[PDB]
Amino acid sequence: QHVDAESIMTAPKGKLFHLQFMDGLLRPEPSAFDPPASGEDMRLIYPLQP
Amino acid sequence: QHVDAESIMTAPKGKLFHLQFMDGLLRPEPSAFDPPASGEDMRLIYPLQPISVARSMRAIVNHNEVDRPRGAVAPSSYEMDTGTLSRNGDLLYSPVA
Amino acid sequence: FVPDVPEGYVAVQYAHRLFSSSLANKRNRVTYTHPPTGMAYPSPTGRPH
């Protein structure tokens, strides 16, 4: 599940919603010879604590 | 199929048996973090000619990050030359100079 | 309405060579190669205009 970029701006002050973050150090890497796939991926909400 | 290491020593002189050789340049490599598997593999009969004479070009794929993928052969500069015919002569190449 | 090219741009001739495929991060990506400076920019964004 993921929070919407509109429910994080026009929601009641009291609400406590949870997010979901990634780790990826044990992510499987690409192969040797391979035709590259298209598309890229976005991050919109970052923490600042840490 | 594979020849036996005993049929290659006690067989009739006239017989013509064929072998089978590997290429492995486009072999899939291992992963990043992985528990290593045991065992190793043997080669008992090698040629001494060398073999592979009919080989125009090889490995038609471009490498992950570098330019030329090791042992890669480009087409011969003669497989791509149309020379005009003479009146008596029939097939001759280009002037080159 | 022809929108004139902006003030300061580098005009590069398209070639079937300046776009190369190389590894960046963990994945394979299509990469640009800047002719006057010779650089990478693997990302579809952040490339010099």
Count of residues for chain A?
50
Task: Identify whether the C-beta of residue B61 lies closer than 8 Å to the C-beta of residue A33.
Answer: yes
Taking the CA atoms of C28, C32, C35 and C37 in sequence, report the sign of the dihedral they define: negative
The number of beta carbons lying within 10 Å of the beta carbon of residue C31 is 20
Count of residues for chain B?
97
**B32·A28 Cβ contact <8 A:** yes
CA angle, residues B21, B24, B30, in degrees to nearest 5: 135
Chain A interface includes B25 (CB < 8 A): no
Task: Identify whether the C-beta of residue B69 lies closer than 8 Å to the C-beta of residue B59.
Answer: yes
- What phi and psi, each to the nearest 5 degrees, are found at residue C32? -80, 160
Smallest Cβ–Cβ distance between A33 and the set B31, B32, B61 belongs to B61
Q: What technique solved it? A: cryo-EM
Task: Identify whether the C-beta of residue C23 lies closer than 8 Å to the C-beta of residue A33.
Answer: no
**Å resolution of this model?**
4.1
Chain B interface includes C19 (CB < 8 A): no
Q: B32 to chain A nearest CA, in Å?
A: 7
Give CA–CA dist A37/A30, Å, rounded.
Answer: 11
